[PDB]
Design brief:
Layout (H helix, E strand, L loop, with lengths): L12 H28 L5 H24 L39 H34 L3
PDB class: protein binding
Keywords: disc1, Ndel1, coiled coil, psychiatric disorder, protein binding
Assembly: monomeric
Length: 145
Amino acid sequence: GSEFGPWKEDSHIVSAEVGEKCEAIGVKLLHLEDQLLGAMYSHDEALFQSLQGELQTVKETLQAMILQLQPTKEAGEASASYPTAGAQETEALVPRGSGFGTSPLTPSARISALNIVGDLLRKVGALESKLAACRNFAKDQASRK
């Protein structure tokens, strides 16, 4: 129930969403890669369908992650003159106030989150290029002439 609540917006939910999501990311590339090579010399079609569903699902997680990291929701517009807040970072040794920025959270999860996002999109690009390259290599082999 949390009578007080050590968090406000992001603290455990954002840290938990990355944990489960991340685990899914790896298991995805693992199953895809293993299925790509095997299906590659099989029917060179199983990898195509897998990529489509893998690209759509991953995009969904990439969208929710990037959105959660980049605030874009407010109550009312034209409402910003004086900064009000009970306590942003008073319990800690470093008294952090508020103003001149939204500030998602302490410098730890922000970097980590953006770290997986970039590392994820990077892995997808390399995998996509490999699939497109392999397909073209096999597609331009049957004809030859």
